[PDB]
Design a protein that fits this description.
beta-lactamase activity; two-stranded antiparallel sheet; alpha+beta; monomer; Beta-lactamase; 36% helix; 9 strands
């Protein structure tokens, strides 16, 4: 058979562009479909963002209290907008950015990296340090979800982001104590039940970070563990550039793409 033909059928059925990368492992070949085409990060950047903050601080930094006002809520912020009076620690912000895709938490973590562009240059530099030469973050939340389809700003490729996640969760980009925190926050994500999780059998472990944006953007990046404990990185990205800025993002496309990948990996 030809898995690329099955991904192409998904693109025609969902009226969408799909990108997939599953890095090769000890026992599998890579799966790649439009893997070197650019797609908007949307909130998937929040996983490497938390890694960047972990990398450049001791773990005691997670208790640092960050204060902010109601005027700092500029993006969908399920946790941060309930804690304006008290503030949130860096660790609480990491948790919220990954598990609730909290936009204010991400903007505050970008500010914690510091430097010009409110942390977006610093974040991009962290990706360069992991060998990612193509990805770039240019805007904060929520504008990073809203670039037009032709813009390279705030884009990655499935290939690039998969190899970033591979280094972070399964490689040695972070020491074990920091790696375990990133892994746990992804493992307890609350936003991803209908995406890669929905394509893997219940006895597979899935950890993930979702992204959604304009032009029908829907992404999910995951690490999955077989029932025998064998890990795979799975990056799935999609958009609907011909469906207008308000094209509906399709979680079901990601779930079916994931089901096709599970068929290869099982």
């Amino acid at each position: 058979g030809d898995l690329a033909d099955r991904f192409a059928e998904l693109e025609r059925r969902y009226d969408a562009r799909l990108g997939v990368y599953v890095p090769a492992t000890g026992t599998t070949e890579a799966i790649e479909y439009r893997a070197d085409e650019r797609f908007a990060f949307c909130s998937t950047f929040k996983a490497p963002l938390v890694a960047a903050v972990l990398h450049q601080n001791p773990l005691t930094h997670l208790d640092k209290l960050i204060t902010y006002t109601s005027d700092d809520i500029r993006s969908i912020s399920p946790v941060a907008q309930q804690h304006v009076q008290t503030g949130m620690t860096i660790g609480q912000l990491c948790d919220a950015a990954i598990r609730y895709s909290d936009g204010t938490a991400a903007n505050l973590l970008l500010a914690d990296l510091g430097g010009p562009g409110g942390g977006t240059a610093a974040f991009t530099g962290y990706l360069r340090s992991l060998g990612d030469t193509v990805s770039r973050l240019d805007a904060e939340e929520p504008e990073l979800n809203r670039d037009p389809p032709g813009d390279e700003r705030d884009t990655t490729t499935p290939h690039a982001i998969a190899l970033v996640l591979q280094q972070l969760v399964l490689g040695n980009a972070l020491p074990p104590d920091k790696r375990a925190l990133l892994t746990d926050w992804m493992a307890r994500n609350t936003t991803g039940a209908k995406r890669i999780r929905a394509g893997f059998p219940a006895d597979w472990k899935v950890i993930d970070k979702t992204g959604t944006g304009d032009y029908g953007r829907a992404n999910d990046i995951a690490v999955v563990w077989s029932p025998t404990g064998v890990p795979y990185v799975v990056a799935v990205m999609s958009d609907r550039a011909g469906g207008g800025y308000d094209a509906e993002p399709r979680e079901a496309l990601l779930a079916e793409a994931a089901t096709c990948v599970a068929g290869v990996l099982a």
